[PDB]
Structure formats: structure tokens, C-alpha cells
Amino acid sequence: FIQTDKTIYTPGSTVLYRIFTVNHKLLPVGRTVMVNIENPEGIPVKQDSLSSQNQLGVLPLSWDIPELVNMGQWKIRAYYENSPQQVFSTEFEVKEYVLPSFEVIVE
Amino acid sequence: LDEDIIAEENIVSRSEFPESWLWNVEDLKEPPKNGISTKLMNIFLKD
Amino acid sequence: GSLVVKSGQSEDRQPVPGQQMTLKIEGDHGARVVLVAVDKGVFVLNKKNKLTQSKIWDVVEKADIGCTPGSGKDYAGVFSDAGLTFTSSSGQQTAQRAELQCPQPAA
């Protein structure tokens, strides 16, 4: 399970994401995880290889988004080293935005 | 200064405007009661 | 288990920028809790791809080996349609399963 602090990011900021490692019983486990980050056009730019060993099934990570980069839908793909075929992914949008001051609901 | 107002030198502007904070990690090792621990955190709200 | 996050102040109203506030956390003993605070204004631009406990169970259920609400055509079908395999010294065994995914939902 991948968790990102925000849902959308601006070019230049930092993305804080944690990877939760558990078994079929949802209980934490220490394994080797391969984490990649692809751009809108499906092109990996950063790849890590950390282990949740003695980390209580929580892998804190972070990556800085360069100013010069394509906007759109980004994806973070992670998978256990013992099963490359099974991949988990979570998307985060990159766009030049500015936080509004009010929300709008359409019901 | 004597006016019924606050001078410019006395107005501390708000600058801390984060979009996401409190990226912390806390463990619940406190004395359990009914299988439910309780940690009291003292956070510092932003501007 | 259970994880609840409420206001430490069992009284008063809304705080003021820069002011401190107690944050009560009621969780299971020995459990580690990771926190994160985000301005609601962000979700106005994007509320998708978040992390919810409901989304977790939705994944677990999809990875179920059972492909039938119950019962079966025969005794060898009841077990197989429930995610099990029966084999005896008398000869009575279940239907050979050699496919990962459940039956292709044939409407």
C-alpha cells in the first residue's frame, strides 16, 4: 500500500510517500521492496531498493520533483523482489496550481 | 503611534503556509487500558 | 483493531494560527502510527487515489480464492467453489484446478 501526503504536486516541491509491507494476513513483514517512479509517458526516472527489515512494515521515502518536467498523471510502482509480476501502483498528479479558498459541491 | 490602532512594526505577518505537514511517526507504548493505548500529542498549528 | 484520532482539548472552540493543541490518539498497544496533515483545499483539485480502509478490504476480497457464494454441483464442486481441495484414500477427490484467477465472469 502506497501513501502520498498530497494528491497533487507542483514542479519544484517534494513528494513524501510511504510503502506499507504486509502479508496475506495483513500483518507486517520484513521483505525487499523495489520502488520505481514513472512519468505521464510511462518512463521510470527513479528506482530504489530498500528493505522493511526491522522497520515494522513501513518504508518512509521522498523524491524531489525538478522544475523542468512534464505535467500530468504520475505513477509510483512498487513490488516485492520475490514477485516482479505482482506490481502495486498509486498515482499523483503534477500541475502548476494554487490552493483556492472555497470548495464547490454538486449534488 | 498614539492612534487607537496597531503600528506596522507591531504586526507579525503569517508566513508558514504549508500544504502538507505533521509528517511524523509515533508509537503507542503507553500503559494500555482495555487494549486501547492513548498518546497525547502537542502539535503546532500552522499559519 | 481500532484507531481513533480526536481533539485533546475536551472543551473550547476553534484554535488560532500558531496556537498549540493536544491531539489524542486511541490505538492498539505496541502499534506504530504514522501521521500526516493536509489542507482540505488540496482535495478540491484532486480527491482521487487516496488511501482508505475500505479500499484495502476491497483488494483483499478480490484476491480471494473462492469463486462461489456457496454450494456446488457435487461434493467435489462444493470444496472447489469454496477454495479447497479434497483427496481421500478411497478415491473421492475434487476437480483439478490449474487456473490462478476465478472463472471469467461469463455473465
Q: C23, B40: Cβ pair inside 8 Å? A: yes
Other Cβ atoms less than 10 A from the Cβ of A97: the count is 17
Q: Domain range for residue C27?
A: 1-62
Residues 6 or more apart whose CB falls under 8 angstroms from that of B46 comprise B16, B17, B18, B21, C17, C18
- Name the B residues in 4-43 with CB < 8 Å from any A CB: 19-20, 23, 25
Which member of A92, A95, A103 has the closest CB to residue C49?
A92
Q: B19, A60: Cβ pair inside 8 Å? A: no
Helix (H, G, I), strand (E, B) or coil at C54: helix
The tally of CA atoms less than 13 A away on the side-chain side of residue B42 is 2
Helical segments of A1-107, H only = none
Q: From the CA atom positions of chain C, what is the Rg in Å?
A: 25
A100 at the C interface (CB within 8 A)? yes
- Resolution of this entry in Å? 3.9
What is the bridge-based pairing of β-strands B25-27 and C32-34?
Answer: antiparallel
**Maximum Cα–Cα distance for chain A, whole Å?**
47
* Grid cell for residue C87: 483427496
- CATH code for the domain of C23: 6.20.50.160
The end-to-end CA distance of chain B, in Å, is 27
Q: Which of A79, A16, B29 is nearest to C25 (CA)?
A: B29
What structural domains and CATH numbers belong to chain B? 1-47 (2.20.130.20)
> What distance in Å separates the CA atoms of residue C40 and residue A62, rounded to the nearest whole number?
22
DSSP state of C96: P
- For chain A, give every domain's residue range: 1-99
Q: B28, C38: Cβ pair inside 8 Å? A: no
Residue with cell 454450494: C71
Q: Provide φ and ψ at B41, rounded to 5°.
A: -95, 140
CB C26 within 8 A of CB B38: yes
- Name the C residues in 25-54 with CB < 8 Å from any B CB: 25-39, 42
Q: Which CATH architecture has domain A1-99?
A: Sandwich (2.60)
Q: A99, B25: Cβ pair inside 8 Å? A: no
Which member of C40, C45, C60 has the closest CB to residue A8?
C45
Residues of B in contact with A58 (CB under 8 A): 25
The continuous run of DSSP H or E covering C75 comes out as: helix C75-80
CB A2 within 8 A of CB A76: yes
> What distance in Å separates the CA atoms of residue A43 and residue A70, rounded to the nearest whole number?
11
Nearest chain B residue (CA) to A4? B20
Residues of C in contact with B36 (CB under 8 A): 2, 26-29
* Grid cell for residue C106: 461469463
- Name the B residues in 11-40 with CB < 8 Å from any C CB: 14, 18-30, 32, 35-40
Q: Provide φ and ψ at A62, rounded to 5°.
A: -160, 150
